Amino acid sequence: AAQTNAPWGLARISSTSPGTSTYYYDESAGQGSCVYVIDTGIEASHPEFEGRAQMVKTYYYSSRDGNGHGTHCAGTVGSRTYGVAKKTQLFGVKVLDDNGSGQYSTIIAGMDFVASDKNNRNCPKGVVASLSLGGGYSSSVNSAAARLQSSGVMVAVAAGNNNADARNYSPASEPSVCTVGASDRYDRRSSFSNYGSVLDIFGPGTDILSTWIGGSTRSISGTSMATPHVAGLAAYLMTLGKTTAASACRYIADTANKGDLSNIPFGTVNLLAYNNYQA
DSSP: OOOOTTTTHHHHOOOOOSSSSOOOOOTTTTEEEEEEEESSOTTTTGGGGTEEEEEESSSSSSOOSSSHHHHHHHHHHHTTTTSSSTOOEEEEEOSSOOTTTOHHHHHHHHHHHHHHGGGGOTTTTTEEEOOOOEEOHHHHHHHHHHHHHHTTTTEEEOOSSSSSBGEEEETTTTTTSEEEEEEEETBBOTTOOOOTTTTOOOESSSSSSEETTTTTEEOOHHHHHHHHHHHHHHHHHTTSSSSOOTHHHHHHHHEEEOOOOBBTTTTSEEOOOOOOOOO
């Protein structure tokens, strides 16, 4: 399939070079897979989700995305226009309040919830979790992410937006999950993106157009935006049966565009998510 005048990020992950505007992808489009967006929630009524989005859990007085951050990330995973896996199933887990903040205890509870909840859901092609969140180093938060991964979920987490080594951030620094840094449309590392040995992969994260609350759209930036590109790509590749939850991160690094990014610090991978779609 082909989506013309797609967001640059979607175009980027199906091309070997920056600067194109068409998103090429297999038409299966992540159908049969499920992605848990662990974030501020999801405006499931947004037309862009086509009914493929639903809340399954909240930790606050409301299930509503009163912020937009989660709706935006969810949109990059699987919205019709702005999503990588346009037929995936989307599950919202609201661990972050309407200011985009959350306690570690909640976030941990959230991961544990997803590890169990996937057993209530029909996801024949496998399960992904996208975590565009994180703060300082936490052993307990890292362990939570590792449990989720171990439970049979493809876990993708943001590297952080501190322009620093992600070794000092969680769940970014958990070795066994997929840690995602951010790039811009010129294949530069995003100015804010964390780096470091713990990163597994880069995805588009500067100026990313996706869904927003009130049935709208907007373009924002962050490793939070890069993460769901990789989560969506996981779900997409899993649906194609090219890889599994356990190996998806490795497979994405295996098949990534290599050495194409600039301002990558020594000891940080130069790999950019890529679907290697050949019609």
